[PDB]
Amino acid sequence: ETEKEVEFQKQRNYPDFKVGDVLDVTMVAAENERKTYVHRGLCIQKRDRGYGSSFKLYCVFSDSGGFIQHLPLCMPDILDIKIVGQVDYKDEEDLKELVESESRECKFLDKVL
Amino acid sequence: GYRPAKPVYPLPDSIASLVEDKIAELKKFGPTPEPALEPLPLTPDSVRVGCITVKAGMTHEWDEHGVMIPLTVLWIDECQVVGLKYFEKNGYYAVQLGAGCVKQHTVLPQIAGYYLKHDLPIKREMKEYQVSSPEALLPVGTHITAAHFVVGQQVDVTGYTTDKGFQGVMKRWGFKGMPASHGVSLSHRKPGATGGRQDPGKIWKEKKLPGHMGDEKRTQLGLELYKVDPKRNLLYVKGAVPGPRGASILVRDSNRMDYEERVALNLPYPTFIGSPDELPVLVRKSDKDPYLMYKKEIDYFPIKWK
Amino acid sequence: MLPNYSFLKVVDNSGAKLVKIIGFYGHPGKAVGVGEVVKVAIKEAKGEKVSAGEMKKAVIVEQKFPVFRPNGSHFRHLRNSCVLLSEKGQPLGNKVRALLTYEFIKPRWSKLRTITTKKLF
Amino acid sequence: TVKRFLRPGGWNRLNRPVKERLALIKNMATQLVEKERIRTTLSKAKNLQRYGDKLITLGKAGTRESWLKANDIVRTDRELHKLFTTLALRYKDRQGGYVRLIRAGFRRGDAAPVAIVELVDREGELRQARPAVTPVPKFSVMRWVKQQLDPKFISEPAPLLPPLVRDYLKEQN
RNA sequence: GAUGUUGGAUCACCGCUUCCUGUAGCUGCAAACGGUUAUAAGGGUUAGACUGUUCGUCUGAUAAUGCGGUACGUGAUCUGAGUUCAAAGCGUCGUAAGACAGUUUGGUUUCUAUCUUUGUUAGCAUAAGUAUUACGGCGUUGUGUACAGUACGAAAGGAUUGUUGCACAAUUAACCAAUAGUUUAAAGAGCAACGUUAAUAAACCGGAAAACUUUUAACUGCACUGUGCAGUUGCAGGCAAAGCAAUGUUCAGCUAAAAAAA
RNA sequence: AUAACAACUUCUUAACUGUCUCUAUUCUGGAUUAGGCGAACUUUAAAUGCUUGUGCAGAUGCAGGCUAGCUAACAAGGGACGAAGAGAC
RNA sequence: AAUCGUACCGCAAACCAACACAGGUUAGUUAUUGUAAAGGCUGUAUAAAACCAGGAUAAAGGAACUCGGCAAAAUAGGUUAUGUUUUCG
Ligand SMILES: [K+]
Ligand SMILES: [K+]
Ligand SMILES: [K+]
Ligand SMILES: [K+]
Ligand SMILES: [K+]
Ligand SMILES: [K+]
Ligand SMILES: [Mg+2]
Ligand SMILES: [Mg+2]
Ligand SMILES: [Mg+2]
Ligand SMILES: [Mg+2]
Ligand SMILES: [Mg+2]
Ligand SMILES: [Mg+2]
Ligand SMILES: [Mg+2]
Ligand SMILES: [Mg+2]
Ligand SMILES: [Mg+2]
Ligand SMILES: [Mg+2]
Ligand SMILES: [Mg+2]
Ligand SMILES: [Mg+2]
Ligand SMILES: [Mg+2]
Ligand SMILES: [Mg+2]
Ligand SMILES: [Mg+2]
Ligand SMILES: [Mg+2]
Ligand SMILES: [Mg+2]
Ligand SMILES: [Mg+2]
Ligand SMILES: [Mg+2]
Prior knowledge:
It is classed as ribosome. The structure is cut from a larger assembly and holds chains A (113 residues), B (306 residues), C (121 residues) and D (173 residues). Chain C has 121 residues and is mainly beta.
């Protein structure tokens, strides 16, 4: 596991983000002929488990409602991650209530590129 | 167990000498064959020997197409030829392989005696593989390493599964049970009926009932060999392998492969000749598109429009 | 993963609001997901195109259950919705208020890919 | 060694609910400190040995945080004072293994197994324990190996006040 | 001096008079869809509304939704809606006590397995290991699509063939890197499917045993009601800056070691 | 006919849910393992296999065809026309 | 001013139930805001089977269960502009 992690770190350099931060993630859609898109959303869960690390991204749209994604951190499809902001919360219960009641999470209405 | 021993009687003096002369003549054997290690041609009906490995665990990786692949890691500590069988003495040709290492004072003298007599280490496990011709026999002491296999082929794995203990019908055989409510009385997880009435009047053999579960020999066929690391004697195989960590696993060329596929792979035969230390790590290449269904209609769709 | 006899919300402008699944096609198993066509009964409709009590075909567009991708990721919605279809396989409306996902990049969903507002791809 | 179970912490159930289980173990731990030797059943002894080792670790810490944790375990003020003052200095150099367990057969009535639990360095000890710091021969492979792997190996007991503290006091005064 | 009722739940063994998946003829068989006869019992034989029902009517799908025997299989495994005790109402019959063979509401379901049958496991009885062959168990499934708008046909309509290719479903076998659920003396634990991998076969699994080989003919035990693929620098204890059943380690317990000199 | 009232019988709506698709994990107690203490139903005699045939007409015990290590433990409940009450119909 | 009761048990192992029986048994008094003074009482040795009983949590669906929403779950409480029915309460 450590051998693979060392190789990955030489290829990518991501920031040390936490739960509650707003992130911009660049990904490749293999289904759509490997086209690049940029997603903006809130980080609601982060798991630090070595090569199996992952996180969840949350966003809300104008009419369609909430949308959640689960993304492996070492997946090659992800190209870049950046921190753009922060959303305050009190505890897990407060964060869960915010997710269920979609509100003030419409950073960008659609995906770029 | 065994049946009680049968009585024996001394032979008459007019027949004892004749019997002993004939028995000794049948038990007299010629010199042991001396196998030679040399490449041989592969024929339409020719089986190779397998190997004994240890299960390490599971991991995952991403391939050239960006797809996640679950993997099982198998380690080959030390596998050697420890004996031979031939027609004159046994009636058929086979190769015996051993693996592992144990201390002398932890095994019975019967087991240790065989290995000491031929200057071989005491090995924890021993298994036999049958060959097709005398020329397929390997010299005693030959090592079977990870280079014995070609990356990208299919293999079969055998072993004993994980012990589960004493389990009921719902978990052991998938019986449905009975309702949780509506008047049921103390029979929620019970097997129900086990027969009829006066006819047939008995319970059939192998009727499914509670019992111990989890320690039995099972074989998985058609697993793919993904990566090979000859220097460290590691094999990466896609899929699940029976047994817990540390289980002894037998690896063999899959019988699902045809002769043409074996010819294309150019499998070593009788085995790899050389030093596996100076070999690189190889990953199989798949000339397939896992996302083809998004450009062409190949998926399953039951409805015909219009 | 929607079992039979589930309720769905209509996200087209044909007039229907609430439908109930009453059958499947082919052999999909015990549950259906995004991209499958089912038979539904209209429970609440306010319009002239459709009326309550009719039976129509529909396609699942959104679901709350995880949808897995070959790369190891998945996504989830916060509602279950569908779009009504005609016997020829075309939508009964002209505006869909939903987020289209990768399932509809396939050639057979060209019409949906044109009338949908927001797309994930 | 002490067996590990599947419950949180891997402890014994002692045939009791968790609430009664914790009340019992705390009382026995208090008595072990007071008397330093106790005879009981095998299951209560195995649990007490592992629990007792972790209670000594808190005493060696000698911090406000450690005392708060221990104050909820020990039942008597006198026993708690002894833990932080007397036992703390006793086991300065010993790294683990502050309690030993030896089996003592079966009882008379219910024929349950029994054992004896005792501290491993004191007057009245059942046996003589190995020194807290193992001496190293001057011309042994062991000495060379420790130099290559752990240059900070401790070979003899250290004084209560190290030279740096002594030097600072001398300079100050 | 007692062989528990109808229907269903749960789990079954068998026959063929074959509903589907097969093979070979005939046809008022161009193709497609059919009709009929002979042969074939390996696998399969759906989810719901009404009704105590068997049955029956209907709805959406399905390759198709076959029949019969087994105390009209199956209550010392479950159910009690109907029927078949004591209460009560209505209608009809009887002067009345009452009757219905009509209807309506309500109404107690016991048993710690001795023998035989069956699933697992240990002890004892001819040392242990490898084991050809033989014997026994299991049963090699189904749909859609591409090769083709091609053969056939005025048009319309629309195929056969395959140790075929691809996707999916059921069944069976396991598996825990990842995903979902679950335990506060908590967790990158363990067990799990809603998750992952594999199978359409002379393959796979179980016990006895010839022969061969080895031995001074072998024989407890790590807290041992999870596993020991761990027996003395052995270890899932303790301790550390550590990924926490891993790495490091001077302590604990089981089981303490050495001729001097040249 | 009838407002109110009903642990009465019938149907429907809202919501809710392991009733169900389809179950999984877990806590407490029993079972299960060890020491001590110590019952009951039942018992013509027993060393008590399968299958077809036979027969007071549905056989552990009779005839043919088969069946060969030994005694128990934990578990299930087909048969012994299993036990209980001199059938109520 | 004589005479009889005064020990001990009394929601109980001492009274009524054949028992040291999860049942039955009258009156008078006492602490306590979200708590609770006095007094009274106390369990053979373990644990990582099936199964059974009494609890807890549960993805997506929500009566598809069943003779029957049996059992379980569920914002359950208070004040209302307006409307309906009344024997006018
Ligand atoms: K059988
Ligand atoms: K595996
Ligand atoms: K500690
Ligand atoms: K047929
Ligand atoms: K009433
Ligand atoms: K029985
Ligand atoms: Mg169930
Ligand atoms: Mg009962
Ligand atoms: Mg129950
Ligand atoms: Mg026939
Ligand atoms: Mg029948
Ligand atoms: Mg019957
Ligand atoms: Mg019965
Ligand atoms: Mg009456
Ligand atoms: Mg009358
Ligand atoms: Mg009259
Ligand atoms: Mg009632
Ligand atoms: Mg596991
Ligand atoms: Mg530890
Ligand atoms: Mg017990
Ligand atoms: Mg007979
Ligand atoms: Mg007979
Ligand atoms: Mg009579
Ligand atoms: Mg749920
Ligand atoms: Mg219903």
